[PDB]
Design a protein around this nucleic acid. Structure first.
Ligand SMILES: [Mg+2]
Ligand SMILES: [Mg+2]
Ligand SMILES: [Mg+2]
Ligand SMILES: [Mg+2]
Ligand SMILES: [Mg+2]
Ligand SMILES: [Mg+2]
Ligand SMILES: [Mg+2]
Ligand SMILES: [Mg+2]
Ligand SMILES: [Mg+2]
Ligand SMILES: [Mg+2]
Ligand SMILES: [Mg+2]
Ligand SMILES: [Mg+2]
Ligand SMILES: [Mg+2]
Ligand SMILES: [Mg+2]
Ligand SMILES: [Mg+2]
Ligand SMILES: [Mg+2]
Ligand SMILES: [Mg+2]
Ligand SMILES: [Mg+2]
Ligand SMILES: [Mg+2]
Ligand SMILES: [Mg+2]
Ligand SMILES: [Mg+2]
Ligand SMILES: [Mg+2]
Ligand SMILES: [Mg+2]
Ligand SMILES: [Mg+2]
Ligand SMILES: [Mg+2]
Ligand SMILES: [Mg+2]
Ligand SMILES: [Mg+2]
Ligand SMILES: [Mg+2]
Ligand SMILES: [Mg+2]
Ligand SMILES: [Mg+2]
Ligand SMILES: [Mg+2]
Ligand SMILES: [Mg+2]
Ligand SMILES: [Mg+2]
Ligand SMILES: [Mg+2]
Ligand SMILES: [Mg+2]
Ligand SMILES: [Mg+2]
Ligand SMILES: [Mg+2]
Ligand SMILES: [Mg+2]
Ligand SMILES: [Mg+2]
Ligand SMILES: [Mg+2]
Ligand SMILES: [Mg+2]
Ligand SMILES: [Mg+2]
Ligand SMILES: [Zn+2]
Lengths: 150, 87, 144, 81, 155, 129
RNA sequence: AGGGGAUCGAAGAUGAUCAGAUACCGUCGUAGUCUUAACCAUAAACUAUGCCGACUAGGGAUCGGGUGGUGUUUUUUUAAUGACCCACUCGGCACCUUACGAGAAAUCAAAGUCUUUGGGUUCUGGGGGGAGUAUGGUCGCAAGGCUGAAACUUAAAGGAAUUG
RNA sequence: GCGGUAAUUCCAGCUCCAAUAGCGUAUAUUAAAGUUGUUGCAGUUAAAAAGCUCGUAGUUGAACUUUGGGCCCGGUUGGCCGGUCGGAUUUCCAACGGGGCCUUUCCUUCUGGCUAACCUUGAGUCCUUGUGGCUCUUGGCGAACCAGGACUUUUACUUUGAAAAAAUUAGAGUGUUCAAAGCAGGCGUAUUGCUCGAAUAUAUUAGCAUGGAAUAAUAGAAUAGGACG
RNA sequence: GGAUAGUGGCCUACCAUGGUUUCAACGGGUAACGGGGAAUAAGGGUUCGAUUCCGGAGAGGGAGCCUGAGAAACGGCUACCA
């Protein structure tokens, strides 16, 4: 329960039993898929997209009205990034912490956090590396990462 | 608990809780056996003629004796409403 | 659920752990370090024959008041110097300096006997014969 | 207590349990059709939001996000499902 | 291993007693000999098509496969024409009634008929001593590349 | 993190029985839990149970009588050598005339007595009595 | 190694106390106490209670979050807000009452679900002294940290509760 | 723990106890010891949770993918008969196991060699009104395994078996007078010989060989470099 | 290639840079020959095996070799050391 702290906090989406429908939802896979592209055409993350589709549209679960997960849709149209989204935001975070640390060397709390963030980063990469989504011998380096996220 | 040849052996086949079906043993001096009298037309209460129930000292200590009885007597016919099987 | 690993492949850790911990066994350690052969006046053997240096008069521990008659013995295979009790009433009268005696343990696993301080051996024989026989009368001490 | 119907729990005491601790779990969020009669068309909003959802054509605001249920804006109207 | 050159030693590399008569003009330059090793191990086509020499080759050389059959998983291909595999194995201990992971490295010859890389599962077949440490000779590759080409650039 | 999903479904049962209850809800069920549940039922140690289908891994509602003192699980699934089935029933059953070691063989999840009659053996799940 | 150095104040010096009084109390007050850049790595660093996971029993408070109500209060013209009241629900810091259950007891919602003995995993202990000593290795500027024996000795040492 | 003047522990006498051709002592080990703990310990206060968090090796790791139904085949015990001159087999009967089919169902795959088994039937029938019954060849079963080609995702576990020294061990047979042993011996026409033996079990890890397909891993098609023809 | 009865870094030339390791290499200790076995009896274990059978090694210590099918032999030779 909770990887890098002692928080327990059970708390998630409770996904609906009905795997299809909603039946008050008209439109079509045809439609929202176009709407998935044009959004990640503007550059947004898949999770960003599902939110944006959930609130303003009728897209309850994208996975259902369409046959597939949002990221897979993106892939299929060739819109997927160099590295997974969750990984990116981890790296992008460790960049911001490092920057703040290089500016505040007296801040031992940040140093501790950097470790944590990086250790999640590295364990995640090792998973990706494992399942061929990142090249074998891909690797997070402080020096190269700052350049990598942006 | 029979033997080699059909013969009954080993004294005393103990009572049981009508509620849990655990054995009610001798030193269980907290167990209880309620006798509820059968009644006939015009309310007469028929002496020596009971619908009876037995509850283990366990169940009674745990405070479950009242609710447990409620069910038991009612799905036998002595109560009408009172107990619900849903919560 | 507390302690030890349970898993089906964790045999090694389970053996190692035991190995590591067996060392807290007082007897095991003595066996494997070869304490016997190394320390301990006898070889590690049951008895040892030695030569009588002086006769002592060890005063017994409390709450006992006595004088325990003993001997200083220099084990032959050894040069190791040792002090040993001479059991029974008189018997010190049988020994005499420079005499040859046969020493045994005290039945206490190293460790001294009772109120006799620092004594971990007793005699058994002198000049080839045995205290027991001498004390009774079945045998006589040899010439020289 | 001591004996009961786990399989057919009552709707009220089911209604009050946590959203992951009901018999089979499901959400208690909902969708609505929302309209501000300046226009003639209805947009669909999630009971919770995070994004401040703008209407069809008019830059308008319809609801601002909160810690949970979005607060619908000013003077509007709605219908669940 | 080999690769290139083939005639790259001080001694001229040739298959013994496989004469090509220069008088008789031939269309393949060099007559080549091979066998099948038996036990239904296919002599691969690179062994026949090839021109490498290797007298420790199970199919084109003077060794025989007899004895054991072992399938290890290849952990080093640094030695020219020989590999080291890790034999994958698992080992019981009665007192505790559990097992403990073990391994053994085995050195095996590998004919230029095969093209092994680290990670491959490889079936090896026993032969006569071939070197100080090698008593085994590859014989068949159960692997391929282990999902290598399925890791190229971006979309 | 849950290691043995079986272990939970067994424990949970024992606790209900001890607290004198008549039903447990267990989570999250498996093929294995069901089959183990099935054996217990074949011998009377529980009544009827029911698989409710969350679109997840499952829940089970068991209805138990009261004839159950213990249903435990053997934590490593030790291999058992048909000769040593004896030694197991001995270590952890109340008498030789009733109670079961229930184990997993190549020929199905079966109580040791069935296992003997069919002449198969294997690894060992828990037990009932 | 610099800066700072009000305060309190190891050391030292003193007044008294005392048989003595190297102290306790009083006075003076060096280091220190604060800060920068480096060291050091230990505290009864404590809940003397490893972590993840399941299950097992009651109750009123409270912190954070959320949901529900023709609740109270704020007046303006009713709302909108805001603080408050009631019900519920996740997650916290805790207390209360019982005990099915556990314990050698004191006690304990875990220290329970253990001779009806197996959910996963880490670590440490094996009578008392000798002794955290000797020795070797390693870290440190030092003080010292980590790792860490034996010979020998000894019938007890120790825990909780009871009566005096 | 006894012994400092009436010593139930010493030195003796008497008497009594225990094991007895044997009994004490010393040292070692084993049982007692769940005080080494896999089975199976203990760690708030008795000895014992690293000050704290990250983390590699190591150990461990949620659920889900052929399940359910139908039909045959032949076994090994047990009941009720026993037909028969202690044990016998058909049918009445349950019970527990093995195999093979059909259900959308590779059983590696072709190319013949083989066929034992019926959807066959070609005649009819010993005989209980007949599907009770098997010999019997010319249309129609593959797998049971020969051997040649072409190819095969990896393991763990379990089963049965092979290969396996004797002596030891467990254990059968046999009256070394008993017995530890030994592997002998036993019957007569004991005057020209007849004869039973010299078993069985265990033999575990690894290697070999066969069956199983639950449990636990491996591998598979996603930039299709996919699958069959 | 040489050597051998014969495979083999066995040895020699040339060439290369490999081989083993926390799944504990390498090193140290062993009052260590291995095994069949022995002791101890709930089970799991623990301790032992110089020693009647199998295998190995040795003949005061080292090395060398003659004979021969077979020995690096010791109730064979040769040298050195004791
Ligand atoms: Mg949780
Ligand atoms: Mg963690
Ligand atoms: Mg959340
Ligand atoms: Mg220690
Ligand atoms: Mg002296
Ligand atoms: Mg000597
Ligand atoms: Mg090389
Ligand atoms: Mg100052
Ligand atoms: Mg002073
Ligand atoms: Mg003074
Ligand atoms: Mg002073
Ligand atoms: Mg400390
Ligand atoms: Mg404290
Ligand atoms: Mg509570
Ligand atoms: Mg509210
Ligand atoms: Mg004393
Ligand atoms: Mg007191
Ligand atoms: Mg007197
Ligand atoms: Mg007297
Ligand atoms: Mg006397
Ligand atoms: Mg005796
Ligand atoms: Mg076990
Ligand atoms: Mg203990
Ligand atoms: Mg303590
Ligand atoms: Mg702690
Ligand atoms: Mg550490
Ligand atoms: Mg699983
Ligand atoms: Mg076998
Ligand atoms: Mg035999
Ligand atoms: Mg070479
Ligand atoms: Mg040279
Ligand atoms: Mg080199
Ligand atoms: Mg080690
Ligand atoms: Mg030796
Ligand atoms: Mg021997
Ligand atoms: Mg030995
Ligand atoms: Mg010797
Ligand atoms: Mg010799
Ligand atoms: Mg000699
Ligand atoms: Mg020498
Ligand atoms: Mg010689
Ligand atoms: Mg000789
Ligand atoms: Zn609008």
């Amino acid at each position: 329960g909770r990887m890098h702290s002692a928080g327990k906090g059970i708390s998630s989406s409770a996904i609906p039993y009905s795997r299809n429908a909603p039946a008050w939802f008209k439109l079509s896979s045809e439609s929202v898929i176009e709407q998935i592209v044009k959004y990640a055409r503007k550059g947004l993350t898949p999770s960003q997209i599902g939110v944006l589709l959930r609130d303003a549209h009728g897209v309850t679960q994208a996975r259902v009205i369409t046959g597939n997960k949002i990221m897979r849709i993106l892939k299929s149209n060739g819109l997927a990034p160099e590295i997974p989204e969750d990984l990116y935001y981890l790296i992008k975070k460790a960049v911001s912490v490092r920057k703040h640390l290089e500016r505040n060397r007296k801040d031992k709390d940040a140093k501790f956090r950097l470790i944590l963030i990086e250790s999640r980063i590295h364990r995640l990469a090792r998973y990706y590396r494992t399942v061929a989504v990142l090249p074998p011998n891909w690797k997070y380096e402080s020096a190269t990462a700052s350049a990598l996220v942006n | 608990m029979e033997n080699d040849k059909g013969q009954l052996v080993e004294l005393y086949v103990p009572r049981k809780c009508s509620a849990t079906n655990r054995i009610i043993k001798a030193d269980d001096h907290a167990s209880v056996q309620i006798n509820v009298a059968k009644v006939d037309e015009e309310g007469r209460a028929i002496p020596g003629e009971y619908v009876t129930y037995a509850l283990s000292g366990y169940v009674r200590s745990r405070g479950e004796s009242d609710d447990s009885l409620n069910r038991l007597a009612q799905n036998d016919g002595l109560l009408k409403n009172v107990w619900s099987y849903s919560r | 659920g507390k302690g030890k690993p349970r898993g089906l492949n964790s045999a090694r850790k389970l053996r190692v752990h035991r190995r590591n911990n067996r060392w807290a066994e007082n007897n095991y350690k003595k066996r494997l370090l070869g304490t016997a052969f190394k320390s301990s006046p006898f070889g590690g053997s049951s008895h040892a024959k030695g030569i009588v240096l002086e006769k002592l008069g060890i005063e017994s521990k409390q709450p006992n008041s006595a004088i325990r008659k003993c001997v200083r013995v220099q084990l032959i295979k050894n040069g190791k110097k040792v002090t040993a009790f001479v059991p029974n009433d008189g018997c010190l009268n049988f020994v005499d300096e420079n005499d040859e005696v046969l020493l045994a343990g005290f039945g206490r696993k190293g460790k001294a006997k009772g109120d006799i301080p620092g004594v971990r051996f007793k005699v058994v024989k002198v000049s080839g014969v045995s205290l027991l026989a001498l004390w009774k009368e079945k045998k006589e001490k040899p010439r020289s | 207590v001591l004996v009961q119907d786990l399989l057919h729990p009552t709707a009220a005491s089911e209604a009050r349990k946590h959203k992951l601790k009901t018999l089979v779990q499901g959400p208690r969020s909902y969708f609505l059709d929302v309209k501000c009669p300046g226009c003639l068309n209805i947009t669909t909003v999630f009971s919770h939001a995070q994004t401040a959802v703008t209407c069809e054509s008019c830059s308008t605001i319809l609801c601002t996000p909160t810690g949970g249920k979005a607060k619908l804006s000013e003077g509007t109207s709605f219908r669940r499902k | 291993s080999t690769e290139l050159t083939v005639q790259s030693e001080r001694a001229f590399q040739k298959q013994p007693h496989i004469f090509n008569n220069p008088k008789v003009k031939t269309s393949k330059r060099t007559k080549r000999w091979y066998k099948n090793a038996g036990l239904g191990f296919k002599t691969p086509k690179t062994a026949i098509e090839g021109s490498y020499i290797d007298k420790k080759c199970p199919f084109t050389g003077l060794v025989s496969i007899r004895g054991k059959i072992l399938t290890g998983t290849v952990v080093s291909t640094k030695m020219h024409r020989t590999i080291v595999i890790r034999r994958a194995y698992l080992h019981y201990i009665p007192k505790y009634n559990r097992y403990e992971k073990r391994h053994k490295n085995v050195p095996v010859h590998v004919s230029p008929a095969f093209r092994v890389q680290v990670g491959d599962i490889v079936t090896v077949g026993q032969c006569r001593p071939i070197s100080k440490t090698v008593r085994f000779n590859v014989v068949k590759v159960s692997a391929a590349a282990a999902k290598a080409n399925k890791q190229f650039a971006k979309f | 993190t849950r290691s043995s999903v079986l272990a939970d479904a067994l424990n949970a049962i024992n606790n209900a029985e001890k607290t004198g209850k008549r039903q447990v809800l267990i989570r999250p069920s498996s093929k294995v839990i069901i089959k183990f549940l099935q054996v217990m039922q074949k011998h009377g140690y529980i009544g009827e149970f029911e698989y409710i289908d969350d679109h997840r891994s499952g829940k089970i509602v068991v209805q138990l009588n009261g004839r159950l003192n213990k249903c435990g699980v053997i934590s490593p699934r030790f291999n058992v050598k048909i000769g040593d089935i004896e030694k197991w029933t001995a270590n952890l059953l109340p008498a030789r005339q009733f109670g079961y070691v229930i184990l997993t063989t190549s020929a199905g999840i079966m109580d040791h007595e069935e296992a003997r009659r069919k002449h198969v053996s294997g690894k060992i799940l828990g037990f009932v009595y």
